[PDB]
Amino acid sequence: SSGLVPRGSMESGFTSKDTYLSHFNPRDYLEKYYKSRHSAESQILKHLLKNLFKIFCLDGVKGDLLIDIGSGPTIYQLLSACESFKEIVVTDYSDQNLQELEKWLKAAPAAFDWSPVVTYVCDLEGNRVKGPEKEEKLRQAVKQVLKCDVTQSQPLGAVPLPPADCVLSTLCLDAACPDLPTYCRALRNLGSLLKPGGFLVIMDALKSSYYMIGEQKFSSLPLGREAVEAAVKEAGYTIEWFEVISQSYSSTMANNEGLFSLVARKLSR
């Protein structure tokens, strides 16, 4: 189609998985969302980083292992977490995305430049280190780069990992879940990776039915904050903290109505 519906959605109503293997360009995605001055995208990124900073450095969400689900090609969402977690596992469905991440982990000269984001977080954190040291500390924290599929009851396949203290997921489950029972199942699937009492940290868009990568359109599940809270509690978690902001992406990039952050814990049997 030609913008009539999201790519890979004509038959099913929702962007198929294969669309993320064929048409998700990580370089274009990074160029569009993480790369002029005080744009909507810039403001959203600052708010995300401030929240991750507050969750991981001021609120002391911490432990041995953190798993980042649906990382895409980005690493901004780990910069503060690596201060509180000894080991980070990064995951995405897209092999293209895993490639971009591993290039950045190798500090390949062709990889995306996160320096401005890194400097921002370092300044949030008090300027105790400069950018380079913060980047290398994250590179060292990232122990595994893995394929994942949230809709599967073992989201990482037969890949054995110790139970994690935290699962983080930014801007992923909306794009990954074609309906609210799938969403809830995905949250339950993520639960299989968590220690009892582990932390679930989700950031995503509210009421977004698509997002753009340039002229390429991808489905989003348009959930309100009540639907998100419902799904999280049904999936077996208790919510400690739940926030909404009005700031939205530019219309040329998504039709979201704000974003949410939440911190939850996996309940008892």
Place this chain on the structure above:
Amino acid sequence: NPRDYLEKYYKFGHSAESQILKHLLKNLFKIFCLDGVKGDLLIDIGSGPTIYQLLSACESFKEIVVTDYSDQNLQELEKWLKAAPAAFDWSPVVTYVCDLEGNRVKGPEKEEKLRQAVKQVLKCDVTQSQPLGAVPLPPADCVLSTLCLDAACPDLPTYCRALRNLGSLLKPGGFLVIMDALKSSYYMIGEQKFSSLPLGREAVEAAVKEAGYTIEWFEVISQSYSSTMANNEGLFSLVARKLS
């Protein structure tokens, strides 16, 4: 081949095809006789060789124009309109619509009201900006298309374009009535396999809105054709209005 289609999809005797036809007849009865879809001119698009989709409509439209891509299909229509002995036997279908209508009428009266209402039998192509070519027609109250556009459009942009082309035959505020297959990529006539656009309901909604219509009513049923004839997963019916 028009008769082969009639034999396979409108055979009589229970069957998935019987059930689909009955639900088609009941939705059109609802649209044209209980609901307020009426007017002076109705145009049916992609009629093929069939008349079942006109049985309730002729109760509400003074004049009807039947169109299709295949002249061979239109010859088959005309055999029934001229009541040739070999023409397809639609009386069990005429009977079932009459009973839906309260047996207000009997078969023969129903068949003659349809023959009188059908005023023109035209060649058409939904992908052209003028779907009827240089044949002029007054602006129509209603355009009707059953099981046509999925077969006619090889992709979703064409589908949207077709809906706009059809709109050019429609007054502002006129009715668009469409019934078609959902998620069907092929349908069979004998062992001849034809292509279909396998679109879901969200894509239909998106195409209709984008072509300049607002949807009044949209229904989907789960009943499909049997495996030997099409791989659809249900059917939709919708009634839309042409925006200004």
Place this chain on the structure above:
Amino acid sequence: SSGLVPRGSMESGFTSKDTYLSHFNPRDYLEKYYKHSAESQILKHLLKNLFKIFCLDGVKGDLLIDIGSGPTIYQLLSACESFKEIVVTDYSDQNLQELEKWLKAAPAAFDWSPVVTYVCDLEGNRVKGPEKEEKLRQAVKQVLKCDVTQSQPLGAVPLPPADCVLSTLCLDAACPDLPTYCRALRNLGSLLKPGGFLVIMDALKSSYYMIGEQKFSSLPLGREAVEAAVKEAGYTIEWFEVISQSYSSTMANNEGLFSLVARKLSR
């Protein structure tokens, strides 16, 4: 709370159950919704739909249970042609009293005869209004308290497994969230035979409805949430319709209504 939020919702965010005993006035509700207008058009569509379901589509059997009847009976008129026995239910005792008055043809009851005449016209004028009303009155065997949020929605009252469960404009008002809604559909499933029919009609994307100046909570679901909830509850949808007609702005903020017919799955 002075309209700022629905009555009974200030603490929880959703109209409490007790509010339906205190503040839901049957006669006011009937005057407001069931007396052209957006409300009349909606009623006409509901009646044409119930006509198609029970008379043309052959949805039929021994026992139908109507859930959340309120004080109304329009939703049973076509049904009593296809069902030997009808059981009506509502959470509100005031509603049940209004129904009992109409069932005994109390002279002070609400007059359904124009609605009755309309349905007799839909059905072919085979009979006139009075005969049809008396067929319905004889068909209604029980009037029962119900609470859709409890796993036995009719409590300990024994009934044979029903052939159909009908629910018009109720579940939205009754369920404060998606999980209660899906659980309520499961509860309703307990009253149905396997392969039994579930027929729901309700508003789309409605967060409140008005009776005069009284504001009641509604659960604002879209068509995909509804389809998802029904399927998780153990049903398979046979047909699902949406219409764009909504209540006038002073009554509710809905964006259309839906109708569906479903069947309780094999186990």
Place this chain on the structure above:
Amino acid sequence: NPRDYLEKYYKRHSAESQILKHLLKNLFKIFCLDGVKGDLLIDIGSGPTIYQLLSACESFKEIVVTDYSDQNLQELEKWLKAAPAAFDWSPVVTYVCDLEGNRVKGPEKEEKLRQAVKQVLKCDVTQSQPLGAVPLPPADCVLSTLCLDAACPDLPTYCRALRNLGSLLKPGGFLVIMDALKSSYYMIGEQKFSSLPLGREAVEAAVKEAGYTIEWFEVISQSYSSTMANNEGLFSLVARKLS
């Protein structure tokens, strides 16, 4: 009684200690990371406390502290005037200094706040002129923590109070509110006070009806001890006054 309140609510590893730390972290975020800043902040229902102005004084040149109770204001002024009978806020002052990067130590922070507070006034949020006859220039930000729940006997009064507060604000100025959710009472020693048990949706409806657009809204589940209040969590919001 203002000193009993202070000893009970703001003196180690308890539900109250947890709530206070959440309040300070959110105040720090709003005023030092989010860039809520300007000329004049008006603190509404301050009681005898100052913790809620520690971060704010970094971003506003002038602060006005207000309360319904004269006793509360005299307790507060005892701290502004560095009287020896004042509550010792130093553990709290230290925590905020630690939140801000230890750019300063306490005594500097303490002095920064004392010269920012320009007036100590009476206020009643239910009156259309909450500060009575005292004229103030239009404020950039109105801050109220744990006040409105205690002050309003019902939701319409809650909403009216929020409009009254807006009469002090410039159009496009900030409203910053933190309060209890679903609390009907709170305890000061043996003495029981009444609270409006608002849910979060009621808070949002009241705020928008009073003529603000909400930029962010956060709820936390953490509650006071049962011996203190029967709240079920807390909320924070930052809203803008519409024109």
